[PDB]
Amino acid sequence: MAKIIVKKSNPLKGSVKIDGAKNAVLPIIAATLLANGKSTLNGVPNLRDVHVISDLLRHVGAEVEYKENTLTVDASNIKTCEAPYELVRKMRASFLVMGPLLARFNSTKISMPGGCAIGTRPIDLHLKGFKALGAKIEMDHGFVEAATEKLVGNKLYLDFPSVGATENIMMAASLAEGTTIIENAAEEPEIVDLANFLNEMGADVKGAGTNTIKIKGVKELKGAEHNVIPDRIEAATYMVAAAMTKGDITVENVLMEHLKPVVAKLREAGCEITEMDNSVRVVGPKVLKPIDIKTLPHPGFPTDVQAQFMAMLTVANGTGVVIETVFENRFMHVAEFNRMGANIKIDGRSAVVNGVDELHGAAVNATDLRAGAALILCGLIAEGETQIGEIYHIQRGYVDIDKKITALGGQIEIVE
Amino acid sequence: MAKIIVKKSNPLKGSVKIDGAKNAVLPIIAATLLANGKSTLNGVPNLRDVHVISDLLRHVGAEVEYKENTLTVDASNIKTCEAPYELVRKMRASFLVMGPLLARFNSTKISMPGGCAIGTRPIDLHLKGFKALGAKIEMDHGFVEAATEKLVGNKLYLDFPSVGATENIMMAASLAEGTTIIENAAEEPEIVDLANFLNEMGADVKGAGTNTIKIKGVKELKGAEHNVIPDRIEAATYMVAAAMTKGDITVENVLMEHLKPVVAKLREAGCEITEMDNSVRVVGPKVLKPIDIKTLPHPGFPTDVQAQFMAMLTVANGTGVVIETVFENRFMHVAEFNRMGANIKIDGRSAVVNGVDELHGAAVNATDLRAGAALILCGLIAEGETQIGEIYHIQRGYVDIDKKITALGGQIEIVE
Amino acid sequence: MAKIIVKKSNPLKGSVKIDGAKNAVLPIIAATLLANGKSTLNGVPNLRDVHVISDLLRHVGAEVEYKENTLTVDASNIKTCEAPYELVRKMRASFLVMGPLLARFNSTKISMPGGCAIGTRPIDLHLKGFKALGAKIEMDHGFVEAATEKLVGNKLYLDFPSVGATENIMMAASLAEGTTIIENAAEEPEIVDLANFLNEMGADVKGAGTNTIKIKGVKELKGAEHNVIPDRIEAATYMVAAAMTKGDITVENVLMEHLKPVVAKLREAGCEITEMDNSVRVVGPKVLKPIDIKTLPHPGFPTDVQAQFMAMLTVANGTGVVIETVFENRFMHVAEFNRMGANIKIDGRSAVVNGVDELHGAAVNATDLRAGAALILCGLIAEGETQIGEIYHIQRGYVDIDKKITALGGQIEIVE
Amino acid sequence: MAKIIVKKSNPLKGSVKIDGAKNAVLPIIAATLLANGKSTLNGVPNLRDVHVISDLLRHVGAEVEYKENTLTVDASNIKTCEAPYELVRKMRASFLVMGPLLARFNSTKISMPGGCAIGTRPIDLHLKGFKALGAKIEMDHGFVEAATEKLVGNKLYLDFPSVGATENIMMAASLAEGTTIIENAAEEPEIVDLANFLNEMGADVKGAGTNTIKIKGVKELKGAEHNVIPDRIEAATYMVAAAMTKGDITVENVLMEHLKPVVAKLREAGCEITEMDNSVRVVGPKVLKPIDIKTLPHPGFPTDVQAQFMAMLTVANGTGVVIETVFENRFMHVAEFNRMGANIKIDGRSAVVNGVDELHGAAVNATDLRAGAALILCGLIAEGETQIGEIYHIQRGYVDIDKKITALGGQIEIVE
Numbered sequence A, B, C, D: 001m002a003k004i005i006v007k008k009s010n011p012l013k014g015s016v017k018i019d020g021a022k023n024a025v026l027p028i029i030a031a032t033l034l035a036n037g038k039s040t041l042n043g044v045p046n047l048r049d050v051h052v053i054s055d056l057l058r059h060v061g062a063e064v065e066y067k068e069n070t071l072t073v074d075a076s077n078i079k080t081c082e083a084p085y086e087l088v089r090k091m092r093a094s095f096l097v098m099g100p101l102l103a104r105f106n107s108t109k110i111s112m113p114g115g116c117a118i119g120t121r122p123i124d125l126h127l128k129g130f131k132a133l134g135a136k137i138e139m140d141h142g143f144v145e146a147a148t149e150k151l152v153g154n155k156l157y158l159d160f161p162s163v164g165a166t167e168n169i170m171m172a173a174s175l176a177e178g179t180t181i182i183e184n185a186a187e188e189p190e191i192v193d194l195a196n197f198l199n200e201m202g203a204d205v206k207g208a209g210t211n212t213i214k215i216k217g218v219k220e221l222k223g224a225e226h227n228v229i230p231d232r233i234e235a236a237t238y239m240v241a242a243a244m245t246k247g248d249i250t251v252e253n254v255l256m257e258h259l260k261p262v263v264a265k266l267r268e269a270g271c272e273i274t275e276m277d278n279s280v281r282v283v284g285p286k287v288l289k290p291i292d293i294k295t296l297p298h299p300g301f302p303t304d305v306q307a308q309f310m311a312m313l314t315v316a317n318g319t320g321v322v323i324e325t326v327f328e329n330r331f332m333h334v335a336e337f338n339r340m341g342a343n344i345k346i347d348g349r350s351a352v353v354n355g356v357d358e359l360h361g362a363a364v365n366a367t368d369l370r371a372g373a374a375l376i377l378c379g380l381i382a383e384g385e386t387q388i389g390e391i392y393h394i395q396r397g398y399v400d401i402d403k404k405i406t407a408l409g410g411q412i413e414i415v416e
């Protein structure tokens, strides 16, 4: 089966256009379900995770059309508020329909997500918020059902600033009676994108981007047109690639406000970075300086770039410590990095990376989306040739990484 | 030597006035050093930690007078920028003078804090920010020296949103040339208090309370008058005490915005809480419902109330999990709670509290400020009599806890 | 694709015969490579992991025949000491050929294992021991090569009492010049089985079962006949199944010495256990008492029974804590248990299990061998019907679990 | 108050005699309480912890005399089986009288130890074993009371191979009716010393040193004479001191079997070690090679030498990782090491030590016994002069460290 073959490459040089944010579009697609009417989403990346949630909307009865990076959804006529096991098993982001369906129809029944490679990922805070809004929750044979005679706005505290719980609760609250206050909300840029979209549909959501979100419920929302923000994680991936290959890359169609910790940490590692209104230029250093990273809720360092920074660190000039506070077991890639000659030792949530002279190409497997991309980065700098298996992980969330890296001068090919 | 004796008490009932925030006043006192002139701080709590940092200002040559909750500082004539080991050993908050002294005099030499009971507490991010502003850092025999020909504003990222590093860097940046941007800043209310004070002196500090702080340096700052915010941690202590004793207490002279997670979590445990403009009423439940807490940077649940919530949980109707993400070893109190009949098991940063019928009085020792106060709370509900040693820990940071609890009906006495 | 369907079952009752130990036979099969001659292994379980390592021996040129639980290996004519990526990727136990091949031929080149679901599982201590014996180690494109002009016995310390490193080093040392001393050796019963086999072939290995193993190298080893010990992990699985179903089961063809912590912990949970010379009877209690388990090196509680005890605890009468010290991320099953109505919260290496009234059947996936078996156990007690996917995990290491549970009265079927 | 002043010293050279083991003598002193008669302990180190437990025996009514390294105890006439709070608070090893007093008198009431600097140190497994032997346990106001009409031998499993629980249970079982089996026993050399002593008094204890201990209870024990084993931890301290100072030291009156991991790890770091029947010679290397250490139950690397190895690593030629599995918070010394210019970062139970050129003398505080000794080691190699406070920690458990290091050529003095 299919592999990505990467060879030791030249310093990457040139421009790369960044696609729309996968993790903005997924909750925003779920939000379309809140409107009796037709929404139009532009800048939608052509990605499997997009197609999966689109098929979920079809299941519940919304009409969906995708072309040329525009997705339209007509959620006028919904026929069921049940998300079955087979769909949720494909992608746990499917859970994001629960808030809108609960809000529109006052009842919804959604398969509870199971295990995921990157950790045990409960959805307790989503249910916490729904209960705060008046919903009664019950479990039936793997399904979670939430139902209410009516949703009523209430104050609620998030024990962790969960991205998904903030999204789900904001969407449910959008049609509740009265005012909902989400305390200790996620501040991730996708939260702000979603809020903006809800407001575009007629909602009243204030404070997205800050630690407190206030939603004043409205009776009905209408389909709206929305331009999704750029993918900050994709952008970060290309930035790290410039860093690691001693390249000089201009990443186009980005928002620098959303990249702050990545910019900072790359500068600390010795990159020269030039921030512009819609683009950023990254020049890799001649010697990578070791740095420590600690993943945290935004605007701390993002967990979705942790594997890729760890890969950069495998050849830094010293010792770097990587600490993952956000996900449990987001170190599955370490053993793959070590097969390429890295020197990485883990205990608990910390990985000690002792920089080596160079990596060496080897047969490796992607374990998840972001780690698979880190493996491509290793492949660019590893002596000889690197063959990466289980490539569906990567293709889930990167548009044409082979084409984009090839256009920057890298040696990469997908073989079937 | 001295002990606090607590007996099984009646439900606490009445009003308690909260003092000014210890942890606002300590950085604000250090900030007075930035002005060639006289500042006036009102609402200063009469606490040892206050007196220690005041003696540090005297050491460096500022004039200090304290009376009746007003502290004045005339920092017109400073005579040394060196903070010696003996003073810093007393209280690691002394380190907060480093930023102002560096800013005023472009050189400062401060003993590096050593071990602390509640964890290994490095000051690397403080030095990170000073280096970003142009300071060269060196170590001499336990001292850290920072010096520059001139401080220049720069962008810098905090790997963790450290309270102290945010404070120290904001103060240093206040007199730097140009604009400093602190990314991933602490959002704690004391950060906002400090900022306000600096602005009162003539500074230009914007975004305190948010994840990004921008300071535009000025050439000189002038003494100003400031009213310190209320102690949210003290307030929380009395709130928990109402919860645990099934009491009914009105806590006076507080800011509800600063108490959000404590209010939320207490309501989840079954308290009835009434929030007012300058006061909050807490009615304890008849049965405490078990809840989980997870300490986090503000506005997450505060580490300074963790021991006290754990004490409440020792008699909750079920199993609660307490997770400390902020400090390493902030569980020293667990063994003391267990001597009073609690059922608490720790591994890593998590403590499993399995609620018991009642605690039983016993001889215990305070291990630190906030835990010592938790022990007084246990003492209120523990059958018989509880004797608490090492009480200096408590007296550091609570004004007249014996008098305030006595006025609420509790049985407490300090014996020498 | 294929599923195991389990329904809510009657208390299991009857006798079950236990197969030979998978994890004794795998290193013992690798050990056959040490002899110029034919070995005969009896009591070999008919398992995929067995067939995989047998195909590895074929690759290197040994002759292998399997029938009726007897496997013979003629390692007279070995044709290569290289274990290629495709084989090692299938099963990391393939790494166990490295020690024998190094010992026989003074050179061997083995693909370095990559990621595994249950954690990052380095082989550094294996290489440590080989280096101690005189081997020079190098890495080539994912391969580890060990070579020496001659192996010389030496003392070496294991930083952790690794099962695999003890095995690999014992086998390498068996043909070394002089005496090897393994300090802080694994004490697992499989270590003793392997040692016995090596001694049967002509080796001189003393102290297996204790914290120190001494091997006095010999010039040549000869094929021998060996009876593998019973599978203590399989036995434990059936014991837990009796516990959870309130059953009454006699587990046949076992060694009670190898089951001590499992017996102890099951008695603590309320089982009545009767230990006999070659069998053990387990009667489940009417109410399971909550217990805590902590995985450790033998004779501590085995990690391979951790998931299955956790499953028992999901319906215990209270709160149990499960602590995994041996593997990092051996909690992947928790989310699957929670889909069946369990109440389990994890942080770090500890899982808090808050017992529920009953589990409820649901669609779940096996994540690994031992967890998949735990899911079958849940399926036996869960109201309604449980469907388990990814069943290859289970079939790897249990002989006919469907047939054996069916013979005890359970409702289980494998569907294709 | 009193300080230890250490200066940068010459390579240590010469011989040092090791005293008797503190941690053998403490349980063996408690064991004297089992005999109606007079015991004679030789090779007793002149240490505060010794004097504290001796005063506890006096409290309960045994007659004690200490001179010239011989301690005699006549436990013919015991007058109380209650150990009060004041004594147990001084030293938690006082808890070791519980097993003997329970065994002699079938009732005993012992204050439950509270917090300790190096971690939360429950005694649940001690109580577990006593309950297994027939004792009913209750808590009264900080006391734990154990009482039985008669102690009856039983099998019991230790969830962790606790040193103290193994000791306490072995002593209780020594006079029980029938046979006690301790499964997953501590294998520490002090367990073997204690067993030997009990057997000297007339007991029947087999398997000490192995993972299973069997005690066959006897009706009465008689006073006996015993020679305590050498202090392996003290010996290790002097060994590390040779390593760190590039010295050449012969440590006298030791048992090499008890020092295995320390010898191994020191050789890995580059020491040349010569093991003899009653002595060991350690020659420090010219360049310390970085190594990783992981504390574990014996014969794994001892937690009591962890701080001292960490100190050695502060100037090793690279990166070393120290992992503490045995105690929670046994890293309090890290901040003190960092005040001397070390580069150590902790997360969880792991500390990353990035070796520096040299340490620099500074004012530091001992946090506990073994760390205080590590600070003296740092003081020997740190440029200039190091002043160590809170020296009672050290004096607890080292005989005349100033005199012994002075006799090896070091510059050390205790000032009052």
Ligand SMILES: CC(=O)N[C@H]1[C@@H](OP(=O)(O)OP(=O)(O)OC[C@H]2O[C@@H](n3ccc(=O)[nH]c3=O)[C@H](O)[C@@H]2O)O[C@H](CO)[C@@H](O)[C@@H]1O[C@H](C)C(=O)O
Residues within 6 Å of the ligand: A023, A024, A026, A093, A119, A120, A121, A122, A123, A124, A125, A126, A160, A161, A162, A163, A164, A165, A302, A303, A304, A326, A327, A328, A369, A397
């Ligand atoms: C669809 C989408 O946007 N997914 C992203 C979002 O996941 P999410 O699930 O919402 O993230 P969280 O809730 O903030 O989760 C953060 C932490 O909080 C725990 N938690 C979360 C919710 C809850 O109810 N209970 C609870 O305990 C949780 O287990 C985790 O430890 O945020 C993550 C963090 O940045 C991303 O890694 C993730 O990207 C992924 C890879 C991708 O592209 O596929």
Ligand SMILES: CC(=O)N[C@H]1[C@@H](OP(=O)(O)OP(=O)(O)OC[C@H]2O[C@@H](n3ccc(=O)[nH]c3=O)[C@H](O)[C@@H]2O)O[C@H](CO)[C@@H](O)[C@@H]1O[C@H](C)C(=O)O
Residues within 6 Å of the ligand: B023, B024, B026, B093, B119, B120, B121, B122, B123, B124, B125, B126, B160, B161, B162, B163, B164, B165, B302, B303, B304, B326, B327, B328, B369, B397
């Ligand atoms: C004077 C004062 O306000 N002290 C308070 C302040 O300490 P601070 O020290 O500033 O808190 P941090 O820097 O946010 O520390 C939080 C975490 O960050 C790590 N860190 C911090 C700084 C740095 O450079 N490097 C670094 O790693 C640090 O080790 C900790 O794990 O904030 C704490 C958290 O709320 C409080 O517990 C603390 O109160 C106390 C008890 C009291 O009243 O005495």
Ligand SMILES: CC(=O)N[C@H]1[C@@H](OP(=O)(O)OP(=O)(O)OC[C@H]2O[C@@H](n3ccc(=O)[nH]c3=O)[C@H](O)[C@@H]2O)O[C@H](CO)[C@@H](O)[C@@H]1O[C@H](C)C(=O)O
Residues within 6 Å of the ligand: C023, C024, C026, C093, C119, C120, C121, C122, C123, C124, C125, C126, C160, C161, C162, C163, C164, C165, C302, C303, C304, C326, C327, C328, C369, C397
């Ligand atoms: C073939 C076989 O017998 N496999 C078993 C054996 O694995 P092994 O691999 O030898 O076990 P370890 O080496 O004792 O591993 C224990 C711990 O030690 C770390 N470690 C190990 C080796 C090394 O060089 N470096 C190092 O760090 C390692 O990462 C782990 O955390 O022992 C394990 C523990 O009981 C079992 O779970 C495992 O069964 C399995 C599931 C099955 O049936 O497939």
Ligand SMILES: CC(=O)N[C@H]1[C@@H](OP(=O)(O)OP(=O)(O)OC[C@H]2O[C@@H](n3ccc(=O)[nH]c3=O)[C@H](O)[C@@H]2O)O[C@H](CO)[C@@H](O)[C@@H]1O[C@H](C)C(=O)O
Residues within 6 Å of the ligand: D023, D024, D026, D093, D119, D120, D121, D122, D123, D124, D125, D126, D160, D161, D162, D163, D164, D165, D302, D303, D304, D326, D327, D328, D369, D397
């Ligand atoms: C008097 C004496 O010999 N003391 C020593 C002994 O303590 P001990 O207390 O017996 O050691 P453990 O019981 O093996 O403790 C090891 C671990 O096990 C947990 N545990 C222990 C008992 C119990 O019931 N429950 C339980 O959870 C415990 O919390 C720890 O994490 O063994 C330790 C380990 O080697 C030493 O560090 C300690 O030396 C000291 C410093 C000194 O010289 O003062």
